[PDB]
Ligand binder design. Sequence first.
Ligand code: HEM
Length: 451
Amino acid sequence: MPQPKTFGELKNLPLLNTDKPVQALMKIADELGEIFKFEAPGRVTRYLSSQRLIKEACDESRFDKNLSQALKFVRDFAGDGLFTSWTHEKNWKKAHNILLPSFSQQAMKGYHAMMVDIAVQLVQKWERLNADEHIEVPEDMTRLTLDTIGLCGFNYRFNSFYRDQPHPFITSMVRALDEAMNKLQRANPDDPAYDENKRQFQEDIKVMNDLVDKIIADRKASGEQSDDLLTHMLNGKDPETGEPLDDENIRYQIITFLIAGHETTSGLLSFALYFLVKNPHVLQKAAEEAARVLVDPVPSYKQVKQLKYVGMVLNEALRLWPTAPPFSLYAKEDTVLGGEYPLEKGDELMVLIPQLHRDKTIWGDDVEEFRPERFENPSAIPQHAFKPFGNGQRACIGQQFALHEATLVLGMMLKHFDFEDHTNYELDIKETLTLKPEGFVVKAKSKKIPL
Ligand code: HEM
């Protein structure tokens, strides 16, 4: 099996000691091909980049979701929430059964108003900028997505558009996620050097737990019913076990929604706007749709569904730069991958999503080009060729939420403003848990359409 360059006893590990590991892995896939082994002291995995191999990896009878070391560290604060639990843990299937109906396309009808609440706040912020000011795109998109998940998730207002420094919960979450990431490179995690890191990590966990537990407590105490996920989780029963989610798991689910949803969704909106300003023909087409469809002061649920080309723009942005990181799988039993690669029970695979989305054998030779017209379309897309939301029963539960949010917001943005790439911005992709176009800025000239 092809394998990248080695660093003696550290094997391939220093290759991910970099600000941009996913992009580094994409460059390794370019020179090595559809499969490569990646080794670290005491660990091994296999990175998959072709639809040919990924299609097999997506066979749930042969492979199940694995928690990468990253997710294992994130579990220290995300607990046995949906994102960081194993399929075979009682709490996975229990929460999946309870939550699935609350995340359906139909359920988006109930979240729409609160999504509009935050989206209007974003539009108003931009309406209120002075002539010689610009927009920090990923920064504002993250304010939007955090507040939207906060409001829709547990009826809590982070009020991100009222501050420079985020709500302490947000600061703690971002810092806990960065520390979970830092542990990946620590050969001696018990070194005194990390004592402060550990102290801060426990502090950040407490900040998050305290806020969420308080909100849950407050809600049970009042008996208040809201249009949020928390109300669903307090009222829900798993048809299988007949059990409701306990308070601690509910807390983990709320933290999980924020971890899994905020940056992935923010990144999507940021990349979508990036591609639009770099492809003014596409922007014109999307803006025509936005103006024709969104005829009311605020968008209705029905109208968002009709933003078809905006949806296509978003899928094409997800094709080129899927914002969620490569996901991990393990072999359920001994099995041979692609007729060439025997695997043992427990062997791990990684699905290198951005590479899959550039499989010139699936998409044609023009994979690097931004063409929403690819998604006209749809479902002609070969099965397992487009996987920004993961796979099977362990796919993104929030997919309908993310797309409704992104379509609504992008539509409003295109209805309300003309955008200028005033710096001729050079794409620079920052990686945290997720990808974003770092330092992407634009100027927005209002079309002066009232809300
Ligand atoms: C463009 C935005 C998003 C993208 C690209 C994305 C991507 C993904 C991917 C790839 C997975 C599978 C991870 C794995 O196999 O380890 C996943 C799972 C998940 N996502 Fe999303 N996500 C997005 C938005 C959201 C939002 C907004 C929410 C919540 C409101 C959310 C909640 C979850 C949860 C709970 C899981 C675990 C589901 C389960 O395994 O039962 N995501 N997401």
